[PDB]
Amino acid sequence: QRGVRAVELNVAARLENLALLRTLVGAIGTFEDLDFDAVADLRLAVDEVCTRLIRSALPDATLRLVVDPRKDEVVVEASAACDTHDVVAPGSFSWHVLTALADDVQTFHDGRQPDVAGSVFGITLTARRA
Amino acid sequence: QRGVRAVELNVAARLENLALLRTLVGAIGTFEDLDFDAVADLRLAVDEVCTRLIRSALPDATLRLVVDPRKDEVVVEASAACDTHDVVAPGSFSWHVLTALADDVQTFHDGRQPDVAGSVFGITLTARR
Amino acid sequence: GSMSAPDSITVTVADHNGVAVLSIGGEIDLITAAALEEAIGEVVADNPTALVIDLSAVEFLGSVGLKILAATSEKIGQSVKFGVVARGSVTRRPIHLMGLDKTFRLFSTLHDALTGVR
Amino acid sequence: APDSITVTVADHNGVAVLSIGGEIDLITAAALEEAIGEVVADNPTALVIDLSAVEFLGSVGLKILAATSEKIGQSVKFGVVARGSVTRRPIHLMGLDKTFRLFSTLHDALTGVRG
């Protein structure tokens, strides 16, 4: 699980925060000494997951972003209460983007029926340090 | 109360996490179009409050920091489970720093007895651009 | 980037000796995608012989921008010389990683693109 | 020293110039104090601490600069280069611009720390 240098960020799950998240992700990737390609890869991959989450998020949902810098890789987990389990449908362009830019990308959700009180949907991905 | 652009940052309350927090706080201020003086003030103010909380924090307390950029002001709140109620107060150099940088420096705690299971101590300030 | 004064993209169109060059600055994301697609549609509507989209000043290129570039290539490419200026980690790299540099012509600089669409 | 701070030592016709870059915080404070201590141990007639390259000046750094001035100011001509929002600004906000001489540039400090 999360090391001592992990950071959890929480912002309202909305389109107005989409660019804010990107700026924070880029700051973390630079702070983690990722090279220029890796910082851009991380920004794009996390922007993709945050866009998908937000665009299905419940009206008053929080987007949670956990960045866990480990020895050889940086692991990111993004999640939000969403109105569907098909936040990132298999076969979509999003899946192609995510697997091109990150490693071990996986979606998951809490199995609750989304229409009742939403269902927390999460995406994890790994940026290799080298 | 929080505005739509509020950012909650949670890290282990350890001195080794201060450099990251300063970088994120600066990125928020820059993104919010604060000018150079205001970004530097925000970074220093938040660095000071986070430093004070960490030096009193329980061994694996979480430091919770909220940066809430508003319309006219940026509101900052930071809290952590601490081993004392005397984390920061008027008369210290720390307090002088905070009030030179911010407009409405306030503290609070939960009244629990710190040596039992710690006591959450909070600092709030308003940095106006 | 404040809520008061949100960031948008910058759009400029110039003719370079017959070639329409659309240049974008800033971040292309789900919010600004409509602005980008409107800008392309306006240039296309003026019926160019050749179109270069210059992403030199683009600070972020989201997946939606990738989609719009490939869709543009599909919707003009037969009737119009099409080229994209992209360099570095933000722009040409994701285009390359997604295989879209096989879909439309990439160039490192505007100077290269201009000779290339001719 | 930690990687997050850089400290270099130079001479300008007998004026010791201690240049700091990176961040001055609780992690790097010891390295800064040790570097000042070393310079002062060699008995300079004048010392300029150049903060031109400093990306963050924490309150501990303000304390170090004030303490240095109090410690050596009587015996060593002392000056600090600081400009802009990171360094000069909080020194003035805390009133510490009165406690040691600030200069906007190294050129000013070098031409000014003697006479």
UniProtKB/Swiss-Prot annotation, chain B:
TM stretches of this protein: none
Keywords recorded for this protein, A-Z: ATP-binding, Hydrolase, Nucleotide-binding, Transcription, Transcription regulation
Induction per the UniProt record: 9-fold induced by starvation.
Source superkingdom: Bacteria
Phenotype of null mutants: A double rsbW-sigF disruption shows no effect in the presence or absence of rifampicin.
Disulfide cross-links: none
Hydrolase among keywords: yes
Listed GO biological process terms: negative regulation of DNA-templated transcription
One GO molecular-function entry: nucleotide binding
Binding annotation for ATP: 90-94
Domain notes: The cytosolic domain interacts with sigma factor SigF.
Family per similarity comment: Belongs to the anti-sigma-factor family.
Subunit structure: Homodimer. Interacts with cognate RNA polymerase sigma factor SigF with a possible 2:1 RbsW:SigF stoichiometry; this inhibits the interaction of SigF with the RNA polymerase catalytic core. Interacts with anti-sigma-F factor antagonist RsfA with a possible 2:1 RbsW:RsfA stoichiometry; this blocks binding to SigF, thus indirectly activating transcription. Interacts with GTPase Obg.
Function: A cognate anti-sigma factor for alternative sigma factor SigF. Alternative sigma factors are held in an inactive form by an anti-sigma factor. Binds ATP and GTP, may hydrolyze both.
This protein's name: Anti-sigma-F factor RsbW
Interval of the full protein contained in this chain: 35 to 163 of 168
Curated annotation (Swiss-Prot), chain D:
Post-translational modification (record): Putative phosphorylation on Ser-59 may prevent interaction with RsbW.
Classification of source organism: Bacteria, Bacillati, Actinomycetota, Actinomycetes, Mycobacteriales
Pfam families for the chain: STAS
NCBIfam families assigned to the protein according to its UniProt record, in alphabetical order: ant_ant_sig
Keyword Transcription recorded: yes
UniProt family annotation: Belongs to the anti-sigma-factor antagonist family.
Gene transcribed to yield this protein: rsfB
Keyword Transcription regulation attached: yes
Residue span(s) of domain STAS: 5-113
PANTHER family assigned to the protein according to its UniProt record, in alphabetical order: ANTI-SIGMA FACTOR ANTAGONIST TM_1081-RELATED-RELATED, ANTI-SIGMA-F FACTOR ANTAGONIST RSFB
Protein name: Anti-sigma-F factor antagonist RsfB
Subunit structure, as described in the record: Interacts with anti-sigma-F factor RsbW (UsfX). Its phosphorylation may prevent this interaction.
